[PDB]
């Protein structure tokens, strides 16, 4: 093709644009290039231009499609310099309604945020190079107490402001008015009654929660922030001397410094000048949006300035106090006045920067794969969904969005979600959205699959690999961070987590605070992000640390997709509801993408989103807009859309759409038939019996369903087990049992306990071998991996079996011929049914799905039997654990989303499985007979009480392990353990496992750890040990005895 490159770059961007384009093209004018090129070369040039692109970069590429018709191919950089057709102007000449209030509050809280570091105890601890001694009181608490002292009890919201606005004021007698929690009589909390005016209370909450949320104990929630007490924020049991030491100020608070007092007076006068500012006091205090945006700015500014080197250009040069000491040497680094002034300056700069984030951040525009119409009648709902989203674009932008992608599995919902959220965007600017998969850990294979399905490169889509990590270093690293005096120096995001992005990171708007190659900067600069919901949960469920900044900025600057959102455990639902509420709070548009969404969960999530959107509309946009959420419904058959301002009309619309979808679902031909199997009731015997039965069962299923070509019969099957240790035991039992009779069996073990690179390799092989279609035998038998395995043996019959944990239900597009499934929950049954013959058409009528009568946890005699995963609890018990009673027999004829989408009536919550699931979901999410709505009905967002009462991913405390090669010898591998930024050595906890092979049974779809490790290290151009520590983690529960490891079976717990 012939392309024409035109550059509108300026200043430093022009030099780099010339340097890059002079190598790919010939000049035609002063800023015009032109060359013949190929598609691959054009993509290479575009990616090179996008990698090193500043804010001034502006390059347009034209193309000649049809005579007298040029076509703009793409624009790299600032797209405002060209019109839609790519022309240039002949001459250029010269909505936040609460930005100023947030800026003033943030600056004032920054000035008063570390005023408690003037304590003699804190100064001594900073200067104490010897053995560290834990401070009795947290510096935030004494800062708040000093604010209370300065403001004076009962003082009006104007008196203290005017007093601080008087520069000619050095009345340190206000220190005598201070209280002391160390002193007896239990002084009242600074928030109770009238100890603080309604505004100083807001500033005090900002001060006291600039390192951690005031999580305490215990109507109390609705009265926040009043019930905050000294015991709520830190505090330790110490002798009276230590407690008293935190209150004496020998060198005086930073009030004598001229610059500090001048800036404080300037801020106070600016606040007083503001019309009506001192009137919204109670409104601002309880406003989640204002408080949380102010706290984000304050915390990010503090995190940035706590790492900067000492500056003698601001603050008293010979001030006696100090704020922190450099961790490298321990010498004092920053004076308290300089620290406070810098934190305030950066707070003001960030408050100014934030409104520009909707135009300064990279976006994805002009994509044709999202607008191109389809040619096959199968994928013709992806166009109805796109048209429905485009019909709503303007109303969605004006009022909000709550979409529901209820299309059945195998229909290609990822491209549909991408197209919907791209349609909702303004065509001139582009789209920015996140894909939050409902998985515990995202492998690189799933991210690459997302890139392939959406047709996006790594210059447009980033992947946040790995999973979120619960606080482990909270005891060790926090000690050093507090000793150095900079407790806000921990990274905004975790350490092992890596963002796989290769796009514009040069001149990002938030480069100054986030960094340049830091994982927060890549997380924010990526137009489209592929992460997990556990990565975005720290936005709303972060109690101690700055983990809430990057997810929150992503939420404010992007849309949201919740893939497989119902896969979350029932106990983790309130966290998801909070996340949806905050997504609606900061202006994001949420699209739920699941095929088995029950009505109760959808209603609760919609209520959360509407509640958040009301407060967002109260702060951003034209005032007076009515909260009419533009709800939309998408499915494989049609797409609707309507506005709803209450959960009363949205429920009716959802019920109508569900009824229509069920009516259209009934007429579908059957492609899956389920048969109940009764099993004969420790591990080495039960697993052996199961392996004995699953020989005849697999033989019967293969005989019923298979593929025939040249007299050779191959069939792909799946066996899903609830837990991993029983899965490994059953794998051993099958392996040391052999083929049933002349039926050569290839087994693949796939669970979540393998090394992440190993797991990704297994997924890569299974996603390439299990892609099927109608009448594909000729290509199926010609596939290399299949070819070698078939030719090696002489048996005409082959059984390619996959033994998988519940990790194979999400993100796996596999077409099996048959499946043997243990019962955990109806959603699992539906998802695994949606995978046997999911790509092929034509059913023989014979049973292809086999369900065991009872799960392993019931054979062992444990009660409740449906738990982890499951819904059965002692509070909601089941009268039976046999599938012959919990399931309606009419369901086995045709299994689809119908039992899950609709709510049966009357509810029998102790005899039917789906009835139990619906009863629990409607009991927790809505109400029925510590409620979720308290997150937005009461000011509970001001404390971490809800996050502790209803925790997320609670229970097991996993530890990170890896098979790290020895530093001296690469061949030798060591079982390590991430303890605190340092991989210890734990060879004593690992032992080899011996596997016995029966007649005619080998293993397929496996990988060697060493070969995969070296291959991925070479691919990523990283050190081999660094690659092992970055992408080879395994999370295992702490066991005293240890584990037994085999490459084909993963780590099995040993006792």
């Amino acid at each position: 093709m012939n392309i024409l490159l035109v550059s509108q770059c300026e200043k430093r961007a022009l030099s780099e644009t010339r340097r890059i384009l002079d190598q790919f093209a010939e000049r035609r004018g002063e800023r015009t290039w032109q060359t013949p090129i190929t598609q691959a070369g054009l993509d290479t040039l575009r990616r090179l231009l996008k990698k090193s692109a500043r804010r001034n970069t502006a390059v347009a590429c034209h193309w000649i499609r049809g005579r007298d018709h040029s076509e703009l191919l793409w624009i790299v950089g600032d797209a405002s310099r060209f019109n839609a057709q790519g022309a240039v102007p002949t001459n250029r000449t010269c909505d936040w309604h609460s930005a100023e209030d947030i800026r003033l509050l943030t600056v004032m809280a920054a000035l008063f945020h570390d005023i408690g570091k003037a304590s003699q105890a804190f100064q001594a601890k900073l200067r104490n190079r010897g053995k560290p001694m834990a401070d009795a009181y947290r510096h935030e608490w004494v800062s708040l107490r000093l604010f209370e002292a300065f403001v004076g009890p009962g003082s009006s919201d104007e008196d203290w402001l005017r007093r601080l606005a008087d520069k000619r004021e050095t009345g340190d007698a206000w220190l005598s008015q201070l209280a002391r929690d160390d002193r007896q009589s239990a002084p009242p909390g600074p928030f109770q009654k009238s100890r603080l005016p309604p505004l100083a209370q807001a500033v005090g909450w900002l001060i006291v929660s600039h390192h951690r949320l005031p999580n305490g104990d215990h109507a109390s929630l609705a009265r926040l922030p009043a019930p905050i007490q000294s015991q709520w924020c830190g505090a330790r049991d110490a002798d009276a001397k230590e407690k008293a030491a935190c209150w004496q100020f020998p060198h005086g608070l930073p009030f004598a410094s001229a610059h500090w007092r001048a800036r404080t007076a300037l801020c106070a006068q600016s606040m007083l000048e503001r019309p009506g500012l001192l009137a919204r006091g109670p409104a601002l205090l309880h406003d989640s949006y204002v408080m949380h945006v102010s706290r984000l700015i304050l915390m990010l500014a503090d995190h940035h300035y706590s790492s900067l080197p000492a500056d003698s250009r601001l603050g008293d040069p010979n001030f006696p106090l100090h704020a922190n000491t450099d961790r490298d040497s321990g010498k004092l680094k920053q004076r308290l006045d300089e620290h406070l002034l810098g934190v305030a300056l950066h707070s003001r700069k960030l408050a100014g920067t934030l409104p520009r984030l909707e135009r300064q951040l990279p976006r994805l525009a002009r994509h044709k794969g999202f607008t191109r119409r389809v040619e096959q009648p199968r994928f013709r709902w992806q166009d109805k969904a796109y048209d429905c989203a485009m019909a709503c674009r303007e109303q969605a932008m004006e009022h909000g969005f709550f979409g529901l992608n209820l299309a059945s599995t195998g229909c290609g919902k990822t491209l549909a979600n991408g197209r919907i959220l791209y349609a909702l965007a303004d065509p001139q600017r582009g789209a920015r959205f996140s894909i939050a998969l409902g998985l515990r850990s995202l492998t690189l294979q799933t991210g690459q699959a997302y890139r392939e399905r959406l047709g996006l490169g790594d210059d447009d889509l980033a992947i946040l690999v790995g999973g979120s990590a619960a606080r482990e270093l909270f005891e060790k690293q926090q000690e050093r961070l507090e000793r150095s005096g900079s407790e806000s120096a921990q990274e905004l995001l975790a350490e092992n987590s890596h963002v796989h992005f290769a796009g514009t990171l040069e001149d990002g708007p938030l480069r100054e605070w986030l960094g340049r190659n830091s994982a927060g900067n890549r997380l924010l600069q990526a137009p489209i992000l592929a992460c997990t919901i556990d990565h975005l949960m720290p936005a709303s469920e972060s109690l101690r640390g700055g983990h809430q900044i990057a997810p929150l900025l992503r939420l404010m600057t992007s849309d949201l997709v919740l893939d497989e959102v119902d896969d979350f455990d029932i106990d983790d639902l309130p966290a998801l509801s909070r996340l949806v509420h905050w997504a609606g709070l900061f202006g994001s548009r949420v699209l739920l993408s699941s095929a088995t969404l029950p009505p109760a969960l959808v209603q609760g999530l919609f209520e959360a989103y509407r509640s958040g959107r009301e407060i967002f509309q109260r702060h951003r946009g034209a005032p007076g807009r009515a909260t009419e959420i533009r709800c939309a419904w998408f499915d494989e058959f049609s797409s609707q859309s309507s506005a709803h301002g209450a959960v009363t009309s949205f429920s009716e619309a959802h019920a109508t759409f569900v009824a229509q979808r069920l009516a259209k679902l009934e007429q579908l031909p059957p492609r899956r038939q389920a048969q109940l199997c009764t099993v004969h009731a420790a591990r080495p015997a039960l697993c052996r019996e199961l392996a004995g039965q699953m020989n005849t069962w697999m033989a019967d299923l293969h005989r019923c369903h298979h593929t025939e070509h040249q007299g050779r019969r191959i069939s792909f099957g799946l066996l899903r087990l609830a837990n991993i240790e029983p899965l490994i035991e059953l794998a051993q039992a099958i392996l040391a049992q052999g083929a049933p009779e002349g039926l050569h069996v290839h087994l693949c073990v796939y669970h979540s306990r393998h090394p992440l690179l190993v797991r990704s390799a297994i997924e890569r092989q299974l996603d390439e071998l299990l892609k099927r279609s109608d009448d594909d035998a000729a290509a199926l038998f010609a596939r290399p991996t299949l070819a070698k395995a078939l030719q090696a043996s002489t048996e005409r019959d082959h059984l390619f079996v996959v033994l998988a944990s519940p990790v194979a239900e999400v993100g796996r597009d596999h077409d099996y011929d048959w499946a043997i499934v243990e019962p955990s929950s109806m959603r699992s049954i539906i998802q695994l049914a949606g995978r046997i013959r999911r790509h092929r058409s034509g059913f023989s009528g014979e049973a292809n799905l086999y369900l065991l009568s009872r799960n392993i946890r019931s054979l062992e005699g444990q009660n409740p039997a449906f738990q982890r995963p499951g819904f059965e609890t002692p509070d909601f018990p089941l009268d039976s654990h046999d599938l012959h009673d919990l399931l309606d027999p009419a369901l086995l004829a045709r299994i689809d989303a119908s039992p899950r989408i609709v709510e049966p009536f009357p509810l029998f919550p102790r005899s039917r499985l789906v009835d139990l699931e619906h009863r629990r979901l409607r009991a927790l999410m809505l109400a029925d007979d510590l409620g979720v709505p308290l997150w937005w009905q009461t000011p509970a967002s001001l404390s971490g009480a809800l996050q502790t009462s209803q925790p997320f991913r609670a229970g097991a405390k996993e530890r990170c392990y890896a098979l790290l090669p020895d530093e001296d010898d690469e061949e030798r591998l060591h079982f390590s353990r991430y303890e605190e930024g340092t991989w210890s050595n734990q060879d004593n906890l690992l032992r080899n496992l011996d596997l016995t092979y029966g007649p005619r049974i080998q293993t397929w779809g496996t990988v060697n750890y060493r070969e995969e490790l070296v291959a991925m290290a070479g691919r990523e151009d990283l050190d081999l040990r660094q690659c092992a520590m970055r992408y080879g983690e395994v999370r295992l529960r702490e066991n005293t005895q240890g584990w037994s490891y085999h490459p084909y079976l993963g780590f099995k717990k040993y006792n």
Partner: protein, 312 residues
């Protein structure tokens, strides 16, 4: 000096801009929030302008426009008429130049034959005979459309066109001619939807459609109207002297002239752009390319000349 009006390639659809004269140049201004951008309009190569929603023009700019014979029309945004006078709609309010003095032969022929109803139905039949021929030509006997993904069922198109011609030959009056035109347009829509594997297409009226095909058809109607108005003004014939669409549409000669190319070049390109995921600008440029390559303006001029000559 400017190009001959029949040899001009550009056509401009403008929105949310301010058309004015800046330093002797006709330019339109778009507000970029903190800046105003001035974009030049090549008046010496533009047949006509179309000012959509949120546009405005000044007397100086309109004077320089009506000095190179550039027509100006006030259309409506999103494929919507200017307004809807009860049961009828007007799409473009044309501002034809009046200082330019146009040829005075075709106008005399038109006014001479126009006031006889039989001689005006003869003209409508001759107008439809060229529309059918050009439909046949473009859809079948030209390769450019086929090489871009248009694969029409030759037999079905042939039988449809033959039936339309047979109905035309036995047309008693204007109403049956209009009914036959509507039937042919609907069958052509179905055939074009099938040819580009577009799926199931149902034509929406008054710009109420949501699928790309309906929007692109409604947009391309404006380009057809602009070219037809240019041709009628160039020949000196007033817009009001219609032969077919004079019963319900003001300035019906524009619609009658535009019908010649509406179903032969706009229709395939609408579906081709829809299948390709094109935006409105890309579809507009593709349609302009199709019209310039096929010399649609010259065809309109020659057809008007032939009808006027055969009228005598």
């Amino acid at each position: 000096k400017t190009i001959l009006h029949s040899k001009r390639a550009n056509l401009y659809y403008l929105q949310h801009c301010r058309v004015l004269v800046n330093g002797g140049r006709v330019e339109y201004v778009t507000d970029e929030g903190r800046h105003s951008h001035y974009w030049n309009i090549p008046i010496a190569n533009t047949t006509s302008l179309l000012l959509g929603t949120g546009t405005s023009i000044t007397q100086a700019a309109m004077r320089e426009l009506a000095r190179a014979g550039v027509l100006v029309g006030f259309c409506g945004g999103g494929g919507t008429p200017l307004f809807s006078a009860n049961e009828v709609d007007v799409e473009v309010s044309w501002l034809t130049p009046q200082s330019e003095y146009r040829p005075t032969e075709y106008l005399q022929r038109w006014v001479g034959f126009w006031f006889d109803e039989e001689k005006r139905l003869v003209a409508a039949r001759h107008f439809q005979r060229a529309r059918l021929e050009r439909i046949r030509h473009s859809w079948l006997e030209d390769r450019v459309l086929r090489d871009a993904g248009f694969a029409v069922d030759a037999t079905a198109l042939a039988v449809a066109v033959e039936d339309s011609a047979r109905a035309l030959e036995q047309a008693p009056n204007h109403e049956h001619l209009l009914t036959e035109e509507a039937r042919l347009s609907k069958r052509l829509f179905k055939l074009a939807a099938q040819a580009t594997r577009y799926g199931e297409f149902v034509r929406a009226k008054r710009g109420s459609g949501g699928d790309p095909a309906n929007r692109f058809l409604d947009h391309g109607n404006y380009l057809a109207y602009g070219l037809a108005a240019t041709a009628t003004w160039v020949l000196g014939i007033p817009h009001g002297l219609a032969v077919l669409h004079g019963k319900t549409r003001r300035g019906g000669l524009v619609f009658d002239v535009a019908d010649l190319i509406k179903d032969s070049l706009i229709l395939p390109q609408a579906f081709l752009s829809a299948m390709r995921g094109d935006e409105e600008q890309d579809f507009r440029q593709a349609c302009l390319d199709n019209l310039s390559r096929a010399q649609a303006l010259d065809f309109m001029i020659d057809t008007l000349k032939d009808v006027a000559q055969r009228s005598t």
